[PDB]
Design an enzyme around this catalytic site. Sequence first.
Site, PDB file in Angstrom:
ATOM      1  N   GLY A  45       0.794  -1.222   0.000  1.00 36.76           N
ATOM      2  CA  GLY A  45       0.000   0.000   0.000  1.00 36.76           C
ATOM      3  C   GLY A  45       0.824   1.269   0.000  1.00 36.76           C
ATOM      4  N   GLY A  47       0.770   5.271   1.963  1.00 42.04           N
ATOM      5  CA  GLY A  47       0.265   6.198   2.965  1.00 42.04           C
ATOM      6  C   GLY A  47       0.624   7.632   2.635  1.00 42.04           C
ATOM      7  N   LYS A  48       0.405   8.535   3.614  1.00 42.74           N
ATOM      8  CA  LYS A  48       0.661   9.971   3.507  1.00 42.74           C
ATOM      9  C   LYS A  48       2.110  10.263   3.127  1.00 42.74           C
ATOM     10  CE  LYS A  48      -0.952  13.589   5.667  1.00 42.74           C
ATOM     11  NZ  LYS A  48      -1.758  14.237   4.596  1.00 42.74           N
ATOM     12  N   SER A  50       4.550   7.388   3.403  1.00 47.67           N
ATOM     13  CA  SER A  50       5.072   6.032   3.523  1.00 47.67           C
ATOM     14  C   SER A  50       4.656   5.118   2.387  1.00 47.67           C
ATOM     15  CB  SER A  50       4.656   5.399   4.851  1.00 47.67           C
ATOM     16  OG  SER A  50       3.280   5.045   4.859  1.00 47.67           O
ATOM     17  N   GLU A  51       5.520   4.129   2.085  1.00 45.92           N
ATOM     18  CA  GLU A  51       5.295   3.086   1.091  1.00 45.92           C
ATOM     19  C   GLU A  51       5.562   1.782   1.783  1.00 45.92           C
ATOM     20  OE1 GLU A  51       6.797   3.179  -2.931  1.00 45.92           O
ATOM     21  OE2 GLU A  51       5.041   4.416  -3.448  1.00 45.92           O
ATOM     22  N   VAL A  52       4.546   0.933   1.840  1.00 46.81           N
ATOM     23  CA  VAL A  52       4.599  -0.349   2.530  1.00 46.81           C
ATOM     24  C   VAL A  52       4.824  -1.483   1.540  1.00 46.81           C
ATOM     25  CG1 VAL A  52       3.456  -1.832   4.252  1.00 46.81           C
ATOM     26  CG2 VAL A  52       3.203   0.652   4.371  1.00 46.81           C
ATOM     27  N   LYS A  67       8.251  -0.791   5.838  1.00 46.55           N
ATOM     28  CA  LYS A  67       7.538   0.465   5.664  1.00 46.55           C
ATOM     29  C   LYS A  67       8.578   1.558   5.430  1.00 46.55           C
ATOM     30  CE  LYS A  67       4.571   3.394   8.546  1.00 46.55           C
ATOM     31  NZ  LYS A  67       4.312   3.501   9.996  1.00 46.55           N
ATOM     32  N   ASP A 155      -4.821   7.073  16.260  1.00 52.32           N
ATOM     33  CA  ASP A 155      -5.229   6.780  14.871  1.00 52.32           C
ATOM     34  C   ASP A 155      -5.895   5.402  14.761  1.00 52.32           C
ATOM     35  OD1 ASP A 155      -5.590   7.534  12.129  1.00 52.32           O
ATOM     36  OD2 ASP A 155      -3.681   6.612  11.548  1.00 52.32           O
TER      37      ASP A 155
HETATM   38  C1  LIG Z   1       2.397  -4.936   9.219  1.00 55.78           C
HETATM   39  C2  LIG Z   1       2.224  -3.490   8.825  1.00 55.78           C
HETATM   40  C3  LIG Z   1       1.716  -3.147   7.581  1.00 55.78           C
HETATM   41  C4  LIG Z   1       1.575  -1.827   7.200  1.00 55.78           C
HETATM   42  C5  LIG Z   1       1.941  -0.808   8.065  1.00 55.78           C
HETATM   43  O1  LIG Z   1       1.791   0.478   7.661  1.00 55.78           O
HETATM   44  C6  LIG Z   1       2.454  -1.123   9.333  1.00 55.78           C
HETATM   45  C7  LIG Z   1       2.709  -0.044  10.322  1.00 55.78           C
HETATM   46  O2  LIG Z   1       2.498   1.128  10.057  1.00 55.78           O
HETATM   47  O3  LIG Z   1       3.175  -0.444  11.467  1.00 55.78           O
HETATM   48  C8  LIG Z   1       2.584  -2.467   9.690  1.00 55.78           C
END
Ligand SMILES: Cc1ccc(O)c(C(=O)O)c1
Length: 327
Positions: A45, A47-48, A50-52, A67, A155
């Site tokens: 995925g 985020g704001k 972040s790249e997971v 992450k 959150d």
């Molecule tokens: C396992 C997992 C997956 C996505 C994430 O963003 C995180 C986290 O932010 O701690 C953890």
Amino acid sequence: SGPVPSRARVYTDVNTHRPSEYWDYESHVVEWGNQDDYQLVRKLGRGKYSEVFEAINITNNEKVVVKILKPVKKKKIKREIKILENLRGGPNIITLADIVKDPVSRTPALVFEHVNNTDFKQLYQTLTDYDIRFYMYEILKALDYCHSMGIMHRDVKPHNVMIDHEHRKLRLIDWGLAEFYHPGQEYNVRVASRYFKGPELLVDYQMYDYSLDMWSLGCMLASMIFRKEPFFHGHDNYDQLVRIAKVLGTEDLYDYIDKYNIELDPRFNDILGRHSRKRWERFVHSENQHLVSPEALDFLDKLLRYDHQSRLTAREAMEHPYFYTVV
Ligand SMILES: Cc1ccc(O)c(C(=O)O)c1
Ligand SMILES: CC(=O)NCCCNCc1ccc(-c2ccccc2)c(Cl)c1
């Protein structure tokens, strides 16, 4: 004169009685691991900032989650790292396994234990009243733990709760917005995702606490038992409070702002209106009645309250009759 000060009813002074080493995240010394130990598999995925990614630790053939953080603010990265290290091993808390850096891009990455997330859109139909009680209890174990450790998650939402339904394993993730609770501190209200935002945040009441998490938890429970996603569907931060007032009524909203001497923003005058206190039983329909019970309604009523001090604590919630069927 100004707003009335407030403090958490539980775990008020846990940080006060701990060394600066515990909560002074800006002084914390971070130690990088080997980025080369990890092979990125696929993007999970975005985020704001972040790249997971799903990855494999090539030194033990084990699946991990990486992450990658856009290092927008250093103080923020350090706070997340410290909190994760402090809570490591806590019940249903995501385990931070390593901290790595990419030298060429000059980018930090947090490495976590892997969680196979079971598809949410397929869970919704088959899920039972017992399943909701079980996972609700698993989330409160994570919350009672982090609050006892002087941390507010700030959150709590379905995206931040990972579930492996096959193994009945739950993890509370993304501690990027989490903060150390210090009695009397005035916090930034731009926290949580809109639907999950507590009235204290919406009315710009800065002296909030752990109880913020209990409101977000109540929003999730209301959404699950009533099959209404999200339960409070605001279109902006002012409308979000208007959506709450359509449920809890406007009379108790005025009792809340009066008790804490809160100055309502002038943007609320034309949109607030007058609303009566609704009965929870009104949200019961053919599609959701199998998940609804008087215990569920009495529990929800105890979480979704304007007054942050009046909400159940995580421990009081675990002692509620709604969880008598869970181990
Ligand atoms: C396992 C997992 C997956 C996505 C994430 O963003 C995180 C986290 O932010 O701690 C953890
Ligand atoms: C990062 C990433 O992959 N996130 C995926 C988020 C997955 N969410 C799924 C889910 C399922 C059930 C609940 C729930 C809620 C209330 C009571 C009991 C269970 C919640 Cl909160 C979330």
